[PDB]
Scaffold this active site. Structure first.
Site, PDB file in Angstrom:
ATOM      1  N   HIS A   1      47.934   5.688 -32.221  1.00 56.04           N
ATOM      2  CA  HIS A   1      48.209   5.838 -30.802  1.00 56.04           C
ATOM      3  C   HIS A   1      47.483   7.091 -30.309  1.00 56.04           C
ATOM      4  CE1 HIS A   1      51.154   8.309 -33.200  1.00 56.04           C
ATOM      5  NE2 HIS A   1      50.509   9.219 -32.489  1.00 56.04           N
TER       6      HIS A   1
ATOM      7  N   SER B   1      45.780   9.874 -33.079  1.00 58.32           N
ATOM      8  CA  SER B   1      46.299   9.881 -34.438  1.00 58.32           C
ATOM      9  C   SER B   1      45.396   9.115 -35.407  1.00 58.32           C
ATOM     10  CB  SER B   1      47.736   9.355 -34.499  1.00 58.32           C
ATOM     11  OG  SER B   1      47.834   8.014 -34.058  1.00 58.32           O
TER      12      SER B   1
ATOM     13  N   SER C   1      45.898  13.772 -28.188  1.00 59.08           N
ATOM     14  CA  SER C   1      45.716  13.767 -29.639  1.00 59.08           C
ATOM     15  C   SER C   1      45.690  12.351 -30.210  1.00 59.08           C
ATOM     16  CB  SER C   1      46.823  14.600 -30.330  1.00 59.08           C
ATOM     17  OG  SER C   1      46.689  14.662 -31.757  1.00 59.08           O
TER      18      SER C   1
ATOM     19  N   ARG D   1      44.859  19.334 -31.260  1.00 55.06           N
ATOM     20  CA  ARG D   1      44.225  20.103 -32.323  1.00 55.06           C
ATOM     21  C   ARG D   1      42.714  20.117 -32.225  1.00 55.06           C
ATOM     22  NH1 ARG D   1      47.431  18.513 -37.482  1.00 55.06           N
ATOM     23  NH2 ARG D   1      48.766  17.796 -35.743  1.00 55.06           N
ATOM     24  N   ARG D   2      42.138  19.025 -31.751  1.00 55.25           N
ATOM     25  CA  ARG D   2      40.693  18.971 -31.593  1.00 55.25           C
ATOM     26  C   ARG D   2      40.390  19.729 -30.316  1.00 55.25           C
ATOM     27  NH1 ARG D   2      37.630  16.061 -34.462  1.00 55.25           N
ATOM     28  NH2 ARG D   2      38.504  14.589 -35.999  1.00 55.25           N
TER      29      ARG D   2
ATOM     30  N   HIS E   1      53.304  12.454 -30.636  1.00 50.00           N
ATOM     31  CA  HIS E   1      53.323  11.624 -31.838  1.00 50.00           C
ATOM     32  C   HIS E   1      54.670  11.024 -32.157  1.00 50.00           C
ATOM     33  CE1 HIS E   1      49.217  13.007 -32.699  1.00 50.00           C
ATOM     34  NE2 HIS E   1      49.657  14.211 -32.379  1.00 50.00           N
TER      35      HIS E   1
END
Lengths: 212, 207
Positions: free
Chosen positions: B117, B111, B109, B125-126, B40
């Site tokens: 992005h 966002s 991930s 996290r998923r 991120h």
């Protein structure tokens, strides 16, 4: 900061029974080792001989084990850590309440939470040590770090204190530290072991920067 | 060598994992390109997403790590890794860069114009968000049993039919320590592998 960082901890834990029930190293076997400090014992990263960050200021065979106090003095190494710590969320989270944030000490506490005397030759700072109780405790004052370990006696600390007192050596780079961290990420029972070492040596009963 | 692009593909969300709704991802997307960055960090764009296909089981994505700078840092880091030196599983050829990427950024991930992005991270996290890297798009896409020939043509149509990485090693190093303290990191990654059936395939996955 480029003010040095001290690191203390047990390199080996001694078998307390008279019959090897714990299968730890006998105290006199390790003391023969010690007996067998005029030549400087280097402190390096994960056994890499090009990655010397400082040296062992003192080694004391005490009741529960062989304690060590080393000094991380390398400006380059400390700069790399300074630079990496500024990009760590873990470090930005901060220590446990009463302690003053210290990005470098905290970065080091998370990265090199273990100590390892082995292939003396050198003591290595690594993500975890193989031997039981080899947790690495960092701090700016050597007196504070020795005070982290309840096992240490007033005499034990004086034993160490006498030694520690009475051109950058780091020839590696951040890539070497980067490769080490990925290996560390795949060491399976790392956190568990760390937590176990913390309890064993009693740093759970003290305030410290230990991330585990 | 290393500065050859590395492709990355995986699910960004799984519609069976107990929030990205099947219906919405499908219509803004399924019925210019998002940058691909490290954890991120907007100053750590290593490439871009080349295709996103909404399929039976989730939101599948395919991106490409193109930054010669990032790849260079990774190649130099990869030769100081003992895990990389251990090599991949037998038939597969040692690919230090692909293996390093597999080790450190095992997760994807998303966002959340509805998304900023896609991020390469130590774990996403998923659940079901394992990042499968490889030199050839067809090969990575093929790592996932779930994907159908139809899905593959869907993604494929999306590729066929300045160095943006302004970060550094020091940044990657700060990232790796954070990853070291994410508690059930390996367990999550192992669950992720089984979930998307990557276990039923040979891959550079290190978990």
């Amino acid at each position: 900061a480029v003010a040095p960082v001290y690191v203390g901890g047990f390199l080996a834990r001694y078998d307390q029974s008279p019959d090897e029930a714990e299968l730890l190293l006998p105290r006199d076997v390790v003391e023969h080792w010690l007996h067998a400090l005029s030549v400087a014992l280097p402190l390096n990263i994960n056994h890499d001989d090009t990655a010397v960050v400082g040296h062992v200021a003192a080694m004391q065979s005490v009741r529960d084990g062989l304690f060590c106090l080393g000094c991380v003095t390398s400006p380059r190494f400390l700069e790399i850590v300074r630079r990496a710590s500024e990009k760590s969320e873990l470090v930005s989270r901060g220590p446990v309440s009463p302690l003053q944030p210290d990005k470098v000490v905290e970065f080091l506490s998370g990265s090199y939470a273990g100590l390892s005397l082995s292939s003396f030759k050198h003591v290595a700072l690594c993500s975890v040590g193989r031997r039981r109780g080899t947790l690495a405790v960092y701090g700016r004052d050597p007196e504070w770090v020795m005070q982290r370990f309840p096992d240490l006696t007033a005499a034990d600390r004086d034993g160490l204190r006498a030694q520690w007192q009475r051109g950058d050596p780091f020839r590696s780079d951040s890539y070497g530290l980067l490769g080490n961290s990925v290996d560390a990420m795949y060491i399976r029972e790392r956190l568990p072991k760390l937590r176990y070492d913390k309890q064993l040596v009693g740093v759970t009963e003290r305030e410290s920067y230990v991330k585990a």
